[PDB]
């Protein structure tokens, strides 16, 4: 008559986190995603954290094995067998990346975004979708990377359209701006768009800087704004 | 394409380590353990590195969860729902700890220590048994632990015996001393013997510190030895 409630599943997610056992954290959060309702702001962050700490170590391992492979291929007297040994290892890690990415992209598409009713929640999920597409795009090529990049672009634009409603100083809105910019520069090969989106988001945040500051420092905040004002103006 | 060879598998072991993927390291190192002969010093490190970084995370988690259990129990308003949750979770980690320990202790007792021909290697493998027995003793309870502590104490004493053949500055010897001393202190609750064993190990090493020291820094080693000597004679009185 006194079994587990939702609070108790959130607790395991936190306990998992504390123990740094993120595979289990992903499963505990998956349980909560299967439940009815919308994820709280606490629960959305636990989701993000879990999946970040599962995909994170793989991207690190991928980058290390990729770099080692680059070195072995660029040799004066290359060893085709060792090169293959590495290449096959990378491919294994690439399979784990796409599994993890695929997994969360499913949940976002089929569960989270369809069941979402809030504005800030929509932006969070659309941002997340765009991120994990960007991670797929980081080791893809050809029609795969084009198709992946296209979906990443959509997710981010959806995120970006709705993010207009939230205040310029909102973490999720700034967070989108940061990643979407990095998406333009590092994937889509678009430095202008990257530079400009980062600039505009940053400037919007600089306008409301007084809202992030205590009244104790509001005059320092103002000179900073004025410095930015003059800087913009020059460049006239 | 050609068959992988021992030298290929040592490279994978090392790739595994670079990627910080220690499950795959423990596997490719198990694969080398099955191949001909005895493990080289390089390979014994890889073996050690692999099992340490698999067990290590579990011990970290076990300590964190045990700490959280402690807090939750000593609350003004303890949460019976959580304490059951935490307990079961600790126990899951304890199982994982036990599987990892058995895996390697089994390997040591059936493969490495039997096929060991060197003194160097014998100490390393006996030390290892002591260590992984100690890790079982770390969370084991009551009567069961005592049996484990005995196995640890045995393996460590065996290590300690053959260790006397190795120089006082030899890493395996100093390594054994460190862990045996920790075993006394933390498992056997024997601070007396812990300090004696660590102190002796440490002093025999300071005596030979000239051998670890470069030619350019010998005068500093000597003043350090004389400082040690004076401290021992002064602490007396």
Residue numbers in the entry:
A (entry chain A): 2 to 237
B (entry chain B): 2 to 238
Extract from the study:
Eukaryotic 14-3-3s are a family of dimeric highly conserved proteins (∼30 kDa) with pSer/pThr binding property. 14-3-3s bind to hundreds of client proteins thus affecting many cellular processes, including metabolism, signal transduction, cell cycle, differentiation, apoptosis, protein trafficking, transcription, stress responses and malignant transformation. Giardia posseses a single 14-3-3 isoform (g14-3-3) showing high sequence identity to the 14-3-3s of the epsilon subgroup.
The structure of the g14-3-3 was determined at 3.2 Å resolution in the P32 space group and the asymmetric unit contained two functional dimers. The g14-3-3 N-terminal dimerization relies on residues largely conserved among the 14-3-3 family members involving, in this case, three salt bridges between Arg22 and Glu97, Asp9 and Lys82, and Glu25 and Lys93. Indeed, helix I of g14-3-3, compared with the human isoforms, is rotated of about 180° around helix H implying a substantial rearrangement of the loop connecting helices H and I (HI loop). As consequence of the helix I rearrangement, the g14-3-3 structure showed a fully open “extended” conformation of the C-terminal region, supporting the notion that the g14-3-3 region encompassing helices G and I possesses a degree of flexibility allowing the binding groove to change from a “closed” to an “open” conformation and thus accommodating different types of peptides. A possible consequence of such exposure of hydrophobic residues is the observed domain swapping occurring between the C-terminus of two g14-3-3 monomers, each belonging to a different dimer, in which helix I' from a monomer interacts with helices F and H from the monomer of the neighboring dimer. Domain swapping entails a dimerization event at the protein C-terminus with the formation of a four-helix bundle between two adjacent g14-3-3 dimers, leading to the assemblage of protein filaments. The overall g14-3-3 crystal packing resulted in stacks of endless parallel filaments, each layer being rotated 60° with respect to the previous one. The observed “extended” conformation of g14-3-3 with the large conformational change of helix I would disrupt the binding groove, which is indeed restored by domain swapping of helix I', indicating that the protein assemblies can retain phosphopeptide binding properties even in the case of C-terminal dimerization. The solved structure of g14-3-3 is not phosphorylated and Thr214 is buried at the C-terminal interface and its side chain establishes a hydrogen bond with Thr222.
